[PDB]
Amino acid sequence: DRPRFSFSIAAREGKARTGTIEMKRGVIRTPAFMPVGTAGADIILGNTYHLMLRPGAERIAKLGGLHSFMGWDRPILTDSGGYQVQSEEGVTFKSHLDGSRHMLSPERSIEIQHLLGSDIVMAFDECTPYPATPSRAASSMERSMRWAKRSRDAFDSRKEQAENAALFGIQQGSVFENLRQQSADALAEIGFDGYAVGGLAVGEGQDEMFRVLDFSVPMLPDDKPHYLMGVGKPDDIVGAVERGIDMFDCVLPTRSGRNGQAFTWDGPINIRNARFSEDLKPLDSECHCAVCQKWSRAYIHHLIRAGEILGAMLMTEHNIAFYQQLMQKIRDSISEGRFSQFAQDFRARYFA
Amino acid sequence: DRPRFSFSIAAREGKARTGTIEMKRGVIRTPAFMPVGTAGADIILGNTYHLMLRPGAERIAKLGGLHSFMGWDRPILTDSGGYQVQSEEGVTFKSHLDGSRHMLSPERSIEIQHLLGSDIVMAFDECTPYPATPSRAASSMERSMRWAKRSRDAFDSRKEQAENAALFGIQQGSVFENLRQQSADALAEIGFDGYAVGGLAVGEGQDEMFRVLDFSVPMLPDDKPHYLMGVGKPDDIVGAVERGIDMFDCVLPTRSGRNGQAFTWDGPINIRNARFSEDLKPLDSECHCAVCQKWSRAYIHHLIRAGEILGAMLMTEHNIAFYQQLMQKIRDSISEGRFSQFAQDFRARYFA
Numbered sequence A, B: 001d002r003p004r005f006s007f008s009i010a011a012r013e014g015k016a017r018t019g020t021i022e023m024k025r026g027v028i029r030t031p032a033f034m035p036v037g038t039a040g041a042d043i044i045l046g047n048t049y050h051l052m053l054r055p056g057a058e059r060i061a062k063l064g065g066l067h068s069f070m071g072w073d074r075p076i077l078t079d080s081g082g083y084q085v086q087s088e089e090g091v092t093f094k095s096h097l098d099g100s101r102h103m104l105s106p107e108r109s110i111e112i113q114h115l116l117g118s119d120i121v122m123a124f125d126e127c128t129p130y131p132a133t134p135s136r137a138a139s140s141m142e143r144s145m146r147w148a149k150r151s152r153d154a155f156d157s158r159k160e161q162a163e164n165a166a167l168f169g170i171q172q173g174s175v176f177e178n179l180r181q182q183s184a185d186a187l188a189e190i191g192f193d194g195y196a197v198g199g200l201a202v203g204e205g206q207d208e209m210f211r212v213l214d215f216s217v218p219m220l221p222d223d224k225p226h227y228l229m230g231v232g233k234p235d236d237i238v239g240a241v242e243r244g245i246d247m248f249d250c251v252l253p254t255r256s257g258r259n260g261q262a263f264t265w266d267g268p269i270n271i272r273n274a275r276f277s278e279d280l281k282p283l284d285s286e287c288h289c290a291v292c293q294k295w296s297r298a299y300i301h302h303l304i305r306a307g308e309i310l311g312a313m314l315m316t317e318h319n320i321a322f323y324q325q326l327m328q329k330i331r332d333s334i335s336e337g338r339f340s341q342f343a344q345d346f347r348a349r350y351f352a
């Protein structure tokens, strides 16, 4: 029987790591990409904010929880709901769907995630806007740390959750090294199963994001998983792994799949462009996915230009699969001691 | 090696028949439902009118024909293009996509279908509008019969087509028995591999459609397949099989699948309705399809209400599968001598 939560590092190269998270419902290979569940992956995401509004967390619990609802028996991660949605108590807001009132606090966020039944629960934080002044970044981060302690206590009070799920704390501090250090220290003093780097992928751009990761990731406990929230494009993932990140989520593969953009080893392509109308190659020449085994760029182009749902489905399947092939190549290259070369080769081709 | 075309009737009950069409690319079990190819089925449809406009028949031929383009190596049926789109020569029209000029005549329709590479080719006809006066129905049907002879001659002139594909003639005559008889006689004198009943499912309603089928289907050669174009809802299919029809096509399973409607043995349901929000049963209680094996009405409701493409995909998979299960039950019941009872039981439950 697997443990509630156990992270093991099997191999390292520079700051990059590869290993496994063992949980009751399954093993998660890291570095991991975690796709949206409503889109192979070891863990999927539930969309807390959306589920709060439709059908509501209590209704999901009545239907048996998200694993039963979605037909997925392996681990599920949920966000805490606030990024998606003010006072020291929490945040209040009205639903556009039916005008109903909703409050969100650390305690209510943890209870919502309990009712959804997720395996990895995020602490309730404030994703500081970018740019932020030092003073506003500090007061925001300080509130998030008080909220992290409240999240910890709420999670620990619910026996089923404490014994079967895991809780991640979220580092804030904007782009400021001293605030990132204070946030890391506060989270480690509380104690979490994993640590997310929050407050990035909010408009700062890759150079600044990587600069912040350079000093921020080493501040977190080395022996616990590191989750970069909201990232990202394939090259963002590669560079973040080089800086010690173990877990990723991003709306891009599905959003791109519905808007005509396919990820390939030679960079993204917009399949609706006329240059693909007679292209008999698969979406990607090396991709092992079922779409690239059977259908051409020309046919996918045709389906999407015709408005056929099949086209969007095939694009999404391809993009999700590409992301998982990327993560597999990352894991194998770290394990084999050739991740530095992989990253260099990946970039040369992706940006050529 | 299978023949170019061979229809065999294995069993009969009343006017209903079950059997097989053997063609070079596969066997088609009848009665058959023929789904749109861009949506198990033995034959799929190509959309001639759409393909003429995007990317064009010549471009499809350059890409290897529809079988290669769509990744489907079994039989394909194409329409002749005119219903979808005037003089004795044919019809002229301008494309809304790019303003280009397109002519359509019996000869050009057959050439388009040749370039697409379809296995069952429809003669180029005029689908008479409904209602029609006797005089207008007669002059329309007479033109269609002249066009049927031109279609036959064009098909026979193209060696690859004549030796490897099949040609169906289309009966017209609106709702008038004498014109339906004249049309049947003219088509049989020309000679076709199969015979379609055209000019129905154009607003006349089920009672009138069945009345016309009652006298029209017996006029066609008994030993050849009978295709009712544009039909239809499940109860239309059952009643048409009772009247001697062997083949069907209809936009409903896919159109309904994209608009929230699911077919079930207890009738159609609109899965977006709030009454399904907590319904843990599968879409249909008896359906063997993968969707009903894994997911609930409540989850499909949620996906479609959320705008997720996955929901539309699952609804479409379910509807296509339901149609093929219906056809399998029809074939088995005729073969077993219990189709009369099946039709009675089907209607009692579908309309309860």
Ligand SMILES: CNc1nc2c(CC[C@H]3O[C@H](OC)[C@H](OC)[C@@H](OC)[C@@H]3OC)c3nc(N)[nH]c(=O)c3cc2[nH]1
Residues within 6 Å of the ligand: A036, A045, A046, A047, A048, A078, A079, A080, A081, A082, A083, A084, A122, A125, A126, A127, A128, A170, A197, A198, A199, A200, A201, A202, A229, A230, A231, A249, A251
């Ligand atoms: C884009 N840059 C981006 N996204 C950040 C999310 C949201 C993650 C959430 O982002 C979407 O929701 C809105 C996703 O829905 C499509 C969720 O997956 C279902 C995902 O939950 C893990 C952050 N969440 C928290 N709690 N705190 C953060 O500091 C943070 C930073 C992010 N940067």
Ligand SMILES: CNc1nc2c(CC[C@H]3O[C@H](OC)[C@H](OC)[C@@H](OC)[C@@H]3OC)c3nc(N)[nH]c(=O)c3cc2[nH]1
Residues within 6 Å of the ligand: B036, B045, B046, B047, B048, B078, B079, B080, B081, B082, B083, B084, B122, B125, B126, B127, B128, B170, B197, B198, B199, B200, B201, B202, B229, B230, B231, B249, B251
């Ligand atoms: C609804 N009532 C309906 N549809 C009739 C179609 C069109 C069939 C065609 O109907 C859609 O195109 C428009 C389908 O596209 C969704 C085509 O499948 C791809 C399908 O081709 C077999 C008829 N076609 C011809 N040539 N002649 C007819 O008399 C006729 C009668 C129909 N009644």
Ligand SMILES: [Zn+2]
Residues within 6 Å of the ligand: A283, A284, A287, A288, A289, A290, A291, A292, A293, A318, A321, A322
């Ligand atoms: Zn692929």
Ligand SMILES: [Zn+2]
Residues within 6 Å of the ligand: B283, B284, B287, B288, B289, B290, B291, B292, B293, B318, B321, B322
């Ligand atoms: Zn089903």
